[PDB]
């Protein structure tokens, strides 16, 4: 033996392991382990959850009545707010499915996982000799599972104002999250769905330029994607025909003729994007929210002109007015 | 019934998932 | 070969068996008919008409 | 012969101006809410 | 009428390469389709007319 | 016979060939002045 | 990488240009602006003026109801002063 | 529950029908000589 | 009252610092 | 011939390619793109919607819109010339008579559009696949705009030309179709998300797997625009993924057809949903919880807490959105929780 | 409305039949 | 070269360019509006 | 409170932004490959397939 | 329209396609006769649907 | 009860002494060339 | 090949395949039914729409009997 | 009878396999809650 | 009537499923080269 | 790794596919009536 925790260390590091196990993935492997098995077996057969601390329990699993569409792993209890609740905080499991135990153990395994997930997009690369930022670009779909998993409840002061492990579940927090912060107002989540958007439109922008620019070396009755091999030398389209074409469509100057310039424009573009609506999320945990245009435009004598910005309002209070039926006893809704 | 259904297919997702990674068809490089 | 989306590709210059293809097509359509209103037949009640 | 980073510069406080009468407009004219 | 198409799908397919399809000239499977959608327009509007 | 709506219509589709005539009008004139080979 | 059309660089660059868009340019500008601080935007587009939503006591909105004789049921919304 | 009686055969046969006609293909490839 | 005398000169003043140096040539 | 002349014209590359498209696509896409900014600033929605929606009003850009027509015009086409307007063009405008304009010019616009995509692509030589592409954007617009209002009682309900406009447009079909319950809505969520994710991750993929072509470290001026070599290492990005991911491309032909499928895939299905709405055809419930619900007090899912939701937007919107149904809801009727 | 995307689908494969299977050389563009 | 002056291109950018600064104006004079 | 919480988290994050690029593109510069993989010595080359 | 779908048969039948159209609208391949056939196809879909 | 905090916390204590002493043992020398 | 009885009788009928007519042909006449037809349809469109009001007409369930 | 002459082999390689039931489950995952309703 | 309500399934898999078996290995058969 | 030198290929002749089908669709006529019962 050459030494083995010297060993251990180059086993770890190894890039010749199927999977690369990093030093993230010493963290990482572990901890969405946990995440998963809880979370499986939480959708499955946990018992209903007090999700509001008002003792009115919320059953989320499919043993318990649910389907794949409403099933959901429910947020801990608004009695332990944002309480560190560990299994060994309980009495008994029976209490600790209750309280909505399993759901920290799942978003604090993931978030810590999925974070080491990202450092381990580094290392391979490191490992590998080729440029690092790749994991910068997951940074994004990152950093916005952490604003609607952790960023949210610490602002707002409870897990059970976290976003739910479901279906369902995730379309109750859009839209009660619009009635408390009128997010579709708000210049972060704009950018978002532009991003979004965009993305996809790029996304079949490039992929149809592209494959609508590949050079023949297929027969008719062939598959066109035969007409290349795993570790060309030389480029499978011909990227001047594909800018001759996009170059026209609209013109010249406004057409991509450098790949390099494309691919970065393909990355920074819906990147950039998402990483505004993380941070709209992130900013609206503490309450800064969309534009409040309500009864701007008036007229000569005082009376209120109603805008669409109006008529968005009325849809918001009747989220807000429904929502959390017996968890309010006073005026304000300040949590 | 329901829930042995959904359970069942999920198994298979995960099932796929194994072979998808570990029995995929080799990468092989330029003699292709 | 031929990708799984191609497969009828093989009658693009074969009026034979684009024909024999059609006829067949045609077939279950009036075939469908048929004995979907046997279908309907077995299960619709005349009883009451208002 | 006119420079050209002066006729951006130019057109570009420009820009901002007349972006800046809009926003200045917003606490102002009827989209106001007083 | 099912059952009769039925059959007559299985005879063209057997019976696959009649003299009809190929072309004199070149002796190669071909169909004049211009003529073709003349002959089915003209039973269309004629089946169409008797409705 | 001719009633208000049809006489809209004729309006209509009569300032409509109109803009349709005038288009390939100047499109057929200028077409013939620059296309050297 | 070129056709026929003059360089917008050198266009842009070009003091013949602004001789003729310090003239132009502008006066679009003072045109629009006349068009609305004249009033007359408010015409040519039926939108109304901030005393022109209601009538003095009346409080209901002027809804279209029918659409044949939606052009003469306007002009009856205008009638009482609105 | 009280859910629909034709709901499990429909899903029964939403998986297996097309997977049975991959397999069928894939297999029948797998299996050419050369 | 109109303050907006003083943005204008602090903000030609920018270009300005570096235009009389398109002037003077140097140093860019 | 006057006609080969009249197609050589056309067909001259220039600055902005015209071609035979052209003479559909520019006059039609010229005039929604300027029938939209001109309502966008003068044009009322008073008559129509009891709203402002003009900056001549005080409206700004996210609340300015060209607002749909009334309900009582139905689906009339509301031409310049029609019964409704007469010829007059300032009622034209208070009848809401510039939206029917928008959607009529914008949809032959995209007919228009997709055409010279097709036309170009012949001329130079590439395949349509672009053309392809282009299907699912028109799709939504023709299922959303047009589609989904034909199956209303008019077009009213379709989604008016703005901002916020669109924002009641994506809130009423919560409150009242259940639209995020829908499975085809799902499938088109996916893809669009799923398509932001291939064109991150592609790009980032390729931005650092890159050769080295130069000895500079902004590496952009270090490409050669004429073919050769490959400018990234596919081999290495395959055994990345490979190793982090687990699966990772190994066909650049396939990998970018797979680009195009997933995000108008997407799109086509989210557009069959909405198809589906229009006859009001709607995924609004699961009738195996709504009976549990009924007879059990104690059962609750997230999927019953939203359908409340619904029922408050429902209530308290209805009555400032539906002006011509002259609602009237009571203090005492409206649902409420406590407190709030 | 799917039968849409049919008729562009192979409205395409028929025009463009000889630029099926992938392209072919030369470098022309900007210039007439 | 002898660049010509009215083109195709000088036509596209007038339709977009003539009319935004028209309501460019218009817009402008809308800020000072009021009750 | 809003007002500085929003502003120093947007800050703070994006700064978790620059730090991870940075931190990058310092390791890639050390060894030696921040601009773009050896052509000739391809590293990926020289390591066994694991398939 | 069945009157004159037989007038229009018969013309089809005896005149014979501009050599400009067969050129243009790739006639003599049948999956032009495809592309027509499917856009009158959803054509008649859409009015059906309609009605 | 009181025992499953304390394995946990081992447990724990292990693969992030294992993270910690990993990158220690001279990581940057781990990669292609320059180390 | 093969030839049959039926098939002999039809062999007129598929046998002018390439045979197309020159230049134009009845293009330009063709162009005129095709405006014709994009303006009847625009015809009973409108009239349908209820944007065309004939006396006579009545667009509705009424009008039956 | 003569052999057709126009007929050729069909493929699906082992990938698409994979991708085709990948596609397959998850469709199946997704409408199984509207199947049971 | 009142059958059984896997009645339907169970015969459905029982049909499919071996059926299934075979033909997947046919087809692999008949594609064999040579 | 080395290919695996005791592989045969499967066979299944058209005739084993008609007797198969043959039976596993009688046994199937059969027992229905007792699965529905
Ligand atoms: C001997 C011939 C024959 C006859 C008399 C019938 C009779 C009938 N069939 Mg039927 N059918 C037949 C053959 C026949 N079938 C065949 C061969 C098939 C297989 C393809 C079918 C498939 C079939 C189905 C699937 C259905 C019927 C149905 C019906 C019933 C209602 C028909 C209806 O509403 O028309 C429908 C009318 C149309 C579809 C009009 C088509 C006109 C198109 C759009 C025009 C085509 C374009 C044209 C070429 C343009 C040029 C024309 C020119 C003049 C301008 C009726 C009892 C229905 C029923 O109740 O079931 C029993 C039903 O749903 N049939
Ligand atoms: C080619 C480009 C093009 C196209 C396709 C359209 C299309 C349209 N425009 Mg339009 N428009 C265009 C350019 C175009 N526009 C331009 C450049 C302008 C600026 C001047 C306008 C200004 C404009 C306005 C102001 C309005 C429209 C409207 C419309 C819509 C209805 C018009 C209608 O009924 O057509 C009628 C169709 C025809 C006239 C075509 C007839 C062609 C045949 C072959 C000629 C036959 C004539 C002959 C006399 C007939 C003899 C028969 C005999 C029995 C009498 C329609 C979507 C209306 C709208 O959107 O309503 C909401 C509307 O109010 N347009
Ligand atoms: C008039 C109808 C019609 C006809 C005759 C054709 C004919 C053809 N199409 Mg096609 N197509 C159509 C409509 C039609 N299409 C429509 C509406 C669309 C849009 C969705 C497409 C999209 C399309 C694409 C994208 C492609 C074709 C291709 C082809 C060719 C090969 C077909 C093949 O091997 O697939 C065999 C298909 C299978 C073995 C799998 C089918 C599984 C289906 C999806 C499940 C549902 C089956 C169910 C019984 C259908 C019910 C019918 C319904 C209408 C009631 C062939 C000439 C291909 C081509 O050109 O090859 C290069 C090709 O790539 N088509
Ligand atoms: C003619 C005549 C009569 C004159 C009148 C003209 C007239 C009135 C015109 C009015 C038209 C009008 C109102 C507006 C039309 C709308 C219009 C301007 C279109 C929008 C176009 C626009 C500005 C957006 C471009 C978007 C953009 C940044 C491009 C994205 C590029 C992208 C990521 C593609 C991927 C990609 C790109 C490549 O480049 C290559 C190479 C490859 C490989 C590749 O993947
Ligand atoms: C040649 C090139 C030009 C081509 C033009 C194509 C169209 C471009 C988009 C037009 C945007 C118009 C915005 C505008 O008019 O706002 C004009 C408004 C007018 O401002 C309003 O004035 C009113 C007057 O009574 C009220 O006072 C309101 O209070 C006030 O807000 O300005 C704004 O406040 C918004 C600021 C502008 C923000 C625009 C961002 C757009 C980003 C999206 C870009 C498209 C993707
Ligand atoms: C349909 C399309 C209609 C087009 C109508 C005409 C549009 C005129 C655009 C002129 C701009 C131009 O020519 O390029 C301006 C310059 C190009 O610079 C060019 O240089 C050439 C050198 O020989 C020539 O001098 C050209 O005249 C000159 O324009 O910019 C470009 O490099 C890229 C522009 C890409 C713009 C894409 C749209 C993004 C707009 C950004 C707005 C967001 C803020
Ligand atoms: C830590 C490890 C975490 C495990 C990750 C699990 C990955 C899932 C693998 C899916 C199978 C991949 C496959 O079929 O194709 C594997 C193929 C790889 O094979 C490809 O073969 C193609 C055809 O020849 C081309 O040749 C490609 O170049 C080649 O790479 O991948 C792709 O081409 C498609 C990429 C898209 C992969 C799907 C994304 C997975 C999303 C899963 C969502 C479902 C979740 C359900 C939850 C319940
Ligand atoms: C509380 C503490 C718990 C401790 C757990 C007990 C110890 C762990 C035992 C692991 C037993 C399972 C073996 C798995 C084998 C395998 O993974 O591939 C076998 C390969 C082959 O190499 C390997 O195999 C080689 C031997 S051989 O080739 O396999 O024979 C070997 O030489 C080489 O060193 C090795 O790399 O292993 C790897 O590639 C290393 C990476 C392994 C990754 C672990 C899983 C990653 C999960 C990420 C999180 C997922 C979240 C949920 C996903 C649904
Ligand atoms: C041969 C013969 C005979 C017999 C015949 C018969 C018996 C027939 C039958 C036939 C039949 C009996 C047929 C049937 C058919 C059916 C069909 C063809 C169906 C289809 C269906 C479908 C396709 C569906 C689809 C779907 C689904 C699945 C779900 C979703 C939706 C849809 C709709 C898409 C006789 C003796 C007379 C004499 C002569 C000989
Ligand atoms: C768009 C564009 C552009 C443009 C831009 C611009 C337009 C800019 C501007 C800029 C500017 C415009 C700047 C300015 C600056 C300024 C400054 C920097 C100043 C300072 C000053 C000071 C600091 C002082 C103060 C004072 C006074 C004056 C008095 C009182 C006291 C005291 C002393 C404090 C360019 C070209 C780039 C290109 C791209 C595009
Ligand atoms: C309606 C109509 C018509 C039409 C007209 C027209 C066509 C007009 C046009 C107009 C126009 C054509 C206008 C334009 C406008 C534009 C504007 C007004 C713009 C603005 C812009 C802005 C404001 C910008 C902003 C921005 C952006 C967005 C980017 C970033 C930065 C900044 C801030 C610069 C006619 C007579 C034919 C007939 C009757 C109906
Ligand atoms: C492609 C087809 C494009 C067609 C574009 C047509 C645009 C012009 O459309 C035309 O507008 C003028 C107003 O300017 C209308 O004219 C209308 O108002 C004028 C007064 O302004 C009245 O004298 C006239 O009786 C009345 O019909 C026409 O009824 C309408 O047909
Ligand atoms: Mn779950 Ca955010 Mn509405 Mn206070 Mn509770
Ligand atoms: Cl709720
Ligand atoms: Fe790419």
Redesign the interface.
């Known amino acids: 033996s050459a030494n083995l925790w010297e060993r251990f260390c180059n086993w770890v590091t190894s890039t010749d392991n199927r999977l690369y196990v990093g030093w993230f993935g010493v963290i990482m492997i572990p901890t969405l382990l946990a995440a998963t098995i809880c979370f499986v077996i939480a959708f499955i057969a946990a018992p209903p959850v007090d999700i509001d601390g008002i003792r009115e329990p919320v059953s989320g699993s499919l043993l318990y009545g649910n389907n794949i569409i409403t099933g959901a792993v429910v947020p801990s209890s608004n009695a332990i707010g944002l309480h560190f609740y560990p299994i060994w905080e309980a009495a008994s499991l029976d209490e600790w499915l209750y309280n909505g135990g399993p759901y920290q153990l799942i978003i604090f395994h993931f978030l810590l996982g999925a974070s080491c997930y990202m450092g381990r997009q580094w290392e391979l690369s490191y490992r590998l000799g080729m440029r690092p930022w790749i994991c910068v670009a997951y940074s994004a779909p990152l950093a916005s599972a952490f604003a609607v998993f952790l960023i949210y409840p610490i602002g707002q002061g409870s897990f059970s104002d976290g976003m739910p492990l479901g279906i369902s579940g995730t379309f109750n927090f859009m839209i009660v999250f619009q009635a408390e912060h009128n997010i579709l107002m708000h210049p972060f989540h704009q950018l978002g769905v532009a991003g979004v958007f965009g993305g996809a439109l790029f996304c079949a922008m490039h992929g149809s330029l592209v494959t609508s620019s590949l050079i023949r070396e297929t027969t008719e009755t062939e598959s066109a994607n035969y007409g290349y091999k795993f570790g060309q030398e030389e480029e499978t389209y011909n990227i001047v025909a594909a800018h001759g074409y996009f170059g026209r469509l609209i013109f010249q100057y406004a057409s991509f003729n450098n790949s390099r310039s494309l691919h970065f424009f393909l990355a920074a573009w819906p990147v950039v994007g998402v990483w505004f609506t993380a941070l709209g999320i992130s900013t609206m945990a503490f309450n800064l929210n969309g534009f409040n245009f309500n009864h701007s435009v008036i007229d000569a004598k005082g009376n209120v002109i109603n805008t669409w910005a109006d008529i968005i309002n009325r849809a918001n209070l009747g989220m807000e007015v429904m929502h959390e039926r017996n968890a309010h006893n006073f005026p304000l809704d300040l949590a | 019934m329901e829930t042995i259904t959904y359970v069942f297919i999920f198994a298979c997702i995960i099932a796929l998932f194994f072979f998808a990674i570990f029995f995929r068809e080799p990468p092989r490089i330029t003699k292709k | 070969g031929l990708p799984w989306y191609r497969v009828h590709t093989v009658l693009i210059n074969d009026p034979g068996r684009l024909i024999a293809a059609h006829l067949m097509h045609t077939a279950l359509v009036a075939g469908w008919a048929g004995s979907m209103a046997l279908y309907e037949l077995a299960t619709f009640d005349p009883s009451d008409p208002v | 012969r006119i420079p050209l980073w002066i006729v951006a510069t130019v057109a570009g406080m420009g820009v901002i101006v007349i972006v800046g009468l809009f926003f200045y407009g917003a606490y102002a004219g009827l989209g106001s809410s007083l | 009428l099912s059952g009769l198409l039925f059959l007559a799908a299985c005879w063209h397919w057997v019976y696959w390469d009649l003299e009809l399809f190929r072309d004199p000239r070149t002796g190669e499977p071909a169909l004049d389709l211009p003529k073709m959608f003349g002959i089915h327009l003209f039973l269309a509007g004629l089946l169409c007319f008797g409705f | 016979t001719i009633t208000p709506s049809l006489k809209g219509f004729f309006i209509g589709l009569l300032s409509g060939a109109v803009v349709l005539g005038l288009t390939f009008a100047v499109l057929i004139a200028i077409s013939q002045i620059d296309k050297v080979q | 990488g070129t056709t026929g059309e003059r360089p917008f660089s050198d266009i842009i660059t070009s003091v013949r240009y602004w001789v003729i868009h310090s003239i132009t340019i502008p006066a679009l500008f003072i045109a629009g602006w006349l068009f609305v601080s004249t009033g007359l935007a408010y015409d040519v587009f039926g939108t109304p003026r901030p005393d022109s939503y209601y009538a003095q006591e009346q409080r209901s909105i002027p809804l279209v109801t029918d659409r044949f004789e939606a052009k003469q049921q306007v002009e009856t919304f205008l009638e009482q002063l609105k | 529950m009280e859910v629909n009686q034709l709901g499990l055969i429909a899903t029964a046969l939403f998986v297996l029908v097309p997977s049975v006609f991959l397999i069928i293909l894939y297999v029948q490839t797998e299996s050419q000589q050369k | 009252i109109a303050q907006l005398t003083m943005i204008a000169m602090i903000?030609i003043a920018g270009?300005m610092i570096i235009?009389l140096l398109?002037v003077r040539r140097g140093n860019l | 011939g006057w006609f080969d002349i009249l197609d050589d014209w056309l067909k001259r590359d220039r600055f902005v390619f015209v071609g035979w498209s052209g003479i559909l696509l520019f006059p039609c896409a010229y005039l929604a793109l300027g029938g939209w900014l001109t309502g966008t600033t003068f044009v009322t929605s008073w008559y129509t919607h009891g709203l402002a929606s003009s900056y001549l009003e005080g409206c700004n850009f996210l609340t300015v819109a060209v607002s749909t027509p009334a309900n009582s015009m139905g689906h009339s086409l509301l031409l310049l010339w029609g019964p409704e307007a007469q010829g007059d063009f300032t009622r034209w405008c208070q009848l809401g008579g510039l939206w029917t304009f928008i959607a009529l010019h914008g949809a032959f616009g995209l007919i228009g559009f997709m055409l010279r995509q097709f036309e170009i692509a012949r001329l130079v030589g590439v395949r349509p696949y672009n053309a392809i592409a282009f299907s699912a954007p028109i799709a939504v617009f023709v299922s959303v705009f047009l589609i989904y209002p034909l199956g209303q009682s008019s077009w009213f309900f379709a989604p008016s030309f703005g901002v916020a406009a669109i924002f009641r447009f994506l809130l009423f079909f919560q409150g009242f179709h259940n639209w995020t319950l829908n499975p085809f809505h799902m499938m088109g969520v996916a893809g669009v998300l799923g398509g932001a994710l291939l064109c991150a991750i592609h790009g980032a993929t390729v931005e650092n797997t890159l050769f080295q072509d130069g000895e500079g470290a902004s590496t952009f001026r270090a490409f050669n625009p004429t073919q050769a070599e490959e400018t990234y290492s596919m081999v290495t990005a395959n055994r990345f993924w490979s190793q982090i991911f687990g699966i990772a491309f190994s066909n650049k032909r396939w990998l970018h057809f797979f680009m195009l499928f997933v995000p108008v895939t997407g799109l086509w299905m989210s557009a069959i949903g909405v198809v589906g709405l229009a006859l009001n055809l709607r995924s609004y419930d699961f009738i195996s919880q709504e009976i549990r619900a009924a007879e059990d007090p104690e059962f609750e899912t997230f999927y019953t807490k939203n359908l409340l939701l619904n029922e408050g937007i429902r209530a308290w919107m209805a009555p400032q959105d539906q002006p011509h149904e002259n609602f009237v809801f009571p203090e005492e009727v409206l649902p409420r929780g406590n407190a709030l | 409305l799917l039968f849409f995307f049919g008729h562009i689908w192979h409205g395409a494969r028929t025009l463009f039949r000889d630029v099926f299977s992938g392209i072919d050389p030369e470098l022309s563009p900007e210039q007439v | 070269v002898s660049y010509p002056i009215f083109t195709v291109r000088w036509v596209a950018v007038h339709t977009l360019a003539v009319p935004t600064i028209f309501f460019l104006g218009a817009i402008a004079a809308m800020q000072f509006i009021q009750r | 409170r809003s007002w500085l919480a929003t502003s120093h988290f947007v800050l703070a994050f994006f700064f978790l932004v620059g730090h991870l690029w940075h931190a990058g593109r310092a390791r890639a510069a050390a060894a030696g490959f921040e601009k773009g993989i050896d052509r000739e010595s391809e590293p990926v080359l020289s390591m066994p397939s694991l398939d | 329209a069945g009157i004159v779908g037989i007038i229009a048969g018969l013309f089809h039948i005896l005149v014979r396609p501009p050599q400009r159209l067969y050129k243009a609208l790739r006639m003599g391949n049948i999956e032009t006769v495809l592309s027509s056939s499917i856009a009158a196809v959803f054509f008649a879909a859409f009015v059906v649907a309609g009605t | 009860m009181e025992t499953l905090k304390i394995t946990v916390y081992i447990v724990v204590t292990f693969f992030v002494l294992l993270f910690v002493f990993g990158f220690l043992s001279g990581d940057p020398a781990r990669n292609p060339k320059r180390k | 090949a093969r030839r049959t009885w039926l098939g002999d009788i039809l062999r007129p009928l598929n046998s002018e395949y390439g045979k197309v007519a020159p230049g134009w042909g009845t293009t330009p006449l063709m162009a005129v039914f095709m405006g014709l037809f994009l303006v009847f349809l625009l015809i009973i469109l409108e009239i349908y729409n209820s944007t065309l009001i004939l006396d006579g007409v009545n667009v509705s369930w009424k009008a039956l009997g | 009878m003569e052999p057709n002459p126009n007929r050729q082999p069909v493929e699906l390689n082992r990938t698409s396999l994979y991708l085709g039931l990948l596609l397959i489950l998850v469709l199946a995952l997704l409408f199984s809650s509207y199947f049971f309703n």
Do not use: L, Q
């Open positions: 903000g270009p235009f398109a």
